C-alpha cells in the first residue's frame, strides 16, 4: 500500500509542481519527512482506481467537483481543520469540499469565468447584457463585433442562462437533490431566449466555438469575450490591451458562472493523515506556501484570505474572485454528467433554430432529471412491496393466514388511499395506480401481489425491477394498463 513516514502528492501537470516541491523541501527541513511531488497524467482517473486497492498518493490536487464522487466510494478521508484554521479561508470555499455533512478536502484556488474586453476598442466595458446589442451595432459600423465566446459548451453560456433563476441542482442543507433540476424554469427560459435573440439578430454566430472566439479576440476582431484565467497567457502573447472585469448583468441580476475550487484531498488509505494535514495547513496554505506555488505557476484566485489580498493587486485575479462569489458552486455529484449533455444539446438545438427555447429546455430537463425521478419512484414502489410483505408476515406470526379476507386492494383516488367500504388491517404509492394481494385459504407458499401503475415506466425502469426480484416478476400488457405481479415469498 502506501509507505508510512512520507508524503506522496499528486497534482496536475499545469499546476505549480516546482513551487510545490519547494514547500516540500521546507517541510522536510523542519520535520525530516521527505515529500515527493509527482504530476503524472490521467490522475483524475488514476486515483479512483489505485485508491480503491488502498494505494495511491497521500494528497491529491484536483477540482472539487470530482471529489464528491471520490467520497461516495470511500476514497477520501474526512479532514479535521480547527475552527481557527477554517477562518483563514473564505467560507464559500468550504462549501465546495463538502459531501454529506463532512469536509473532505482543503480548498486551494478559486476559478470562474470573467468578461475579457479590448481596452482600445472598448475602454468602458458594459455592465448589462441588454446594452450589448446596441454596442454591437455601433461596433459593426467600424468592422468589429461586440462579443464572441464559446457557444458550443454549456459551461460558457450558463452564466447568462442561470442569471435569472437557472440552476443545476438544488443545494439544500449540505446536500444536492438529484431529482430537482432548474433547466426549464422561467429564469433559464429568459436567459436562453436572450442568447438566441442575439444570434437571430446577427450579433453572434451559433457556430462560434472556443478556438474561433479566442482567435477573433486575439486578432482584435471582437471587443469582448468570455473566458477563464487559463486563456490569459494566450492573450499576453497577442499583446492586445485587454482587461478582466465582472460579467454583465441580465435583468438587473449578476451572471452566475460555475465556480471551480482546486482542492487537496487526503487518501483514506493513507497512514500519514496527520502529516498530510500538517503539510497542507501550516506549510502549503500559508502566504509563503501559496506564493512559492504561484511563483512556479499562477493559481488565479486563492481560498486563503491573507494571500488573496496580495494576488488581488492583479485586477484580473480580483475580477475572477468577484465573478466567483456571485456565481454558483459547481455541484460535486456525478449526476452532473447527465446535466452537461442535457444542457449542451438544448443550447445547440435552440441556437441553430432546430427547436424552440421551450422545447429545448423541456427536453433538457427530462434528459437531466427524469431518470433520477424514476429511481426514487421505483424505490418507493419497492418500499411499499416490502411493507406489504412485512405486514403480511406480521399477520402470520399472530394469526394463521396471510390475507385473512380473500383479497386486499389499495387504489389511489384524489390524494388519499382507500380500501373500499371495509377495513382489513402509510404507503406513498408513487405511481398512484392500484395494488392487489392474492391468496387462497391454505398452504404456506402462495402470495401474489399485482400492481397496475398509472403514468408510464421506462424500459430502464422495468429492467431495474427484473434485476432485484429475479424470476419473481412477470410483466404483462406493455400497452394500456401495464401489469406487474410479484410472488412475495421465495
Residue numbers in the entry: 1 to 370, 1026 to 1080, 1089 to 1153
Verbatim from the authors:
Previously, our group and others found that type IV pili, filamentous helical appendages polymerized from protein subunits, promoted microcolony and biofilm formation in C. difficile. T4P are helical fibers extended from the cell surface through the noncovalent polymerization of thousands of protein subunits called pilins. Like PilA1, PilW has a single transmembrane helix (α-1N) followed by a soluble domain and a central α-helix (α-1C) with a β-sheet packed against it.
Additionally, we have resolved the X-ray crystal structure of PilW, which we use to model possible structural mechanisms for the formation of C. difficile biofilm through interactions between type IV pili and the DNA of the extracellular matrix. The majority of the two structures is superimposable, including the four strands of the PilA1 β-sheet and the C-terminal α-helix (which is also found in a superimposition of PilA1 and PilJ); the most obvious point of divergence is the αβ loop, which has a short helical section in PilA1, but adds two strands to the β-sheet of PilW. The conformer found in chain C of our crystal structure can be accommodated in our pilus model with only minor adjustments to the backbone, while the conformer in molecule B would require a total rearrangement, leading us to conclude that the chain C conformation is close to the native conformation found in the assembled fibers. Like other type IV pilin proteins from Gram-positive bacteria, PilW lacks the C-terminal disulfide bond found in the vast majority of their counterparts from Gram-negative bacteria. Unlike PilA1, PilW does not have a two-strand anti-parallel β-sheet in its place, despite the overall similarity of the two structures in this region. Equivalent residues in similar positions can be observed in the PilW structure, at Lysine 30 and Aspartate 85.
